[PDB]
Amino acid sequence: KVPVVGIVAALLPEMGIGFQGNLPWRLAKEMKYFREVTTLTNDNSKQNVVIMGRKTWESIPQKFRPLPKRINVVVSRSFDGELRKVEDGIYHSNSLRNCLTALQSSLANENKIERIYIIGGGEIYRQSMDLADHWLITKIMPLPETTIPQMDTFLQKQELEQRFYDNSDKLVDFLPSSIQLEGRLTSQEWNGELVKGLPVQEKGYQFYFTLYTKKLEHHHHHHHH
């Protein structure tokens, strides 16, 4: 009953997200968006959860982790159980799926979690296409004179577009209420695809905050007792 939201910054057209254990760009304004969206809540007495693969945890500078003011969950197959507190602000889980089931228990969470953000791993993102209710995708494009950065990790665009549609018309309303953006909603063509969302430019890059939402589903079966 808590929304599960993938949040990722991806370079078009291949949707590259990483290179050699790190982000392929350093964009302060995109960091800011990610920080604000995952931190802020509409209900002041709730926090969000952020879930991340082990390798992504290890990529965060020691100073900056665990991410302040959000419940941090790190998943590793070598960890001990489905959701276990190991330190202030840090939970360990040995299973993405079971930790999500554990976070959803209103007995455990007291209805004091507002959203669950999946904040990456390429490998984590691969397994979240079936788990996430929405995706917040920052679609990044190199500007004309900008060198395309090398990349070795990618968002699964095929599986995204199978399950989700571009709901970016509703991006503004979706975001926690107290965030202000600099763009207006814009639809732009870029290398033969439609890019729609809230525009920013920084360094050699143009980027759009977008929202994707699960497509409507037919009613095939509902479990009865």
Ligand X SMILES: NC(=O)C1=CN([C@@H]2O[C@H](COP(=O)(O)OP(=O)(O)OC[C@H]3O[C@@H](n4cnc5c(N)ncnc54)[C@H](OP(=O)(O)O)[C@@H]3O)[C@@H](O)[C@H]2O)C=CC1
Give the residue numbers of the binding site for NADPH: 9, 17, 22, 54-56, 76-77, 96, 121-124, 127
Q: Which of 11, 12, 27, 30 is catalytic?
A: 30
Binding residues: 9, 17, 22, 54-56, 76-77, 96, 121-124, 127
CA–CA–CA angle 220, 223, 225 (5° rounding): 145
Specify whether 217 is catalytic: no
Can you tell me which of 46, 54, 65, 157 binds ligand X, judged by CB under 6 A? 54
Specify whether 82 is catalytic: no
Instruction: State yes or no: residue 75 binds ligand X (CB under 6 A).
Output: yes
Of residues 102 through 121, those in contact with ligand X by CB under 6 A are 119-121
- Joined tokens for residue 154: 């990618």
Instruction: State yes or no: residue 22 binds ligand X (CB under 6 A).
Output: yes
Instruction: Fill in the per-residue mask, 70 to 109: x = in contact with ligand QLR (CB under 6 A), - = not in contact.
Output: ----------------------------------------
**CA-to-CA distance for 57 and 216, rounded, in angstroms?**
34
Binds 60, which of ligand X, ligand QLR, none (CB < 5 to 8 A, cut-off by type)?
ligand QLR
Residue number with the smallest Cβ distance to ligand X: 121
Binds 222, which of ligand X, ligand QLR, none (CB < 5 to 8 A, cut-off by type)?
none
Binds 192, which of ligand QLR, ligand X, none (CB < 5 to 8 A, cut-off by type)?
none
Place of tokens 């991410």: 67
- Residue closer to ligand QLR (CB basis): 26 or 106: 26
Instruction: State yes or no: residue 156 binds ligand X (CB under 6 A).
Output: no
Q: Under a CB-based contact definition with an 8 Å cutoff, are residues 169 and 42 in contact?
A: no
Q: How far is CA 142 from the centre of its chain?
A: 21
| Contact range with ligand X by CB under 6 A, out of 18-26, 62-70, 174-182, 205-213 | 18-26
- Catalytic center residues: 23, 30
List residues binding ligand QLR (CB under 6 A): 7-9, 23, 30-31, 34-35, 52, 56, 59-61, 64, 119-120, 138
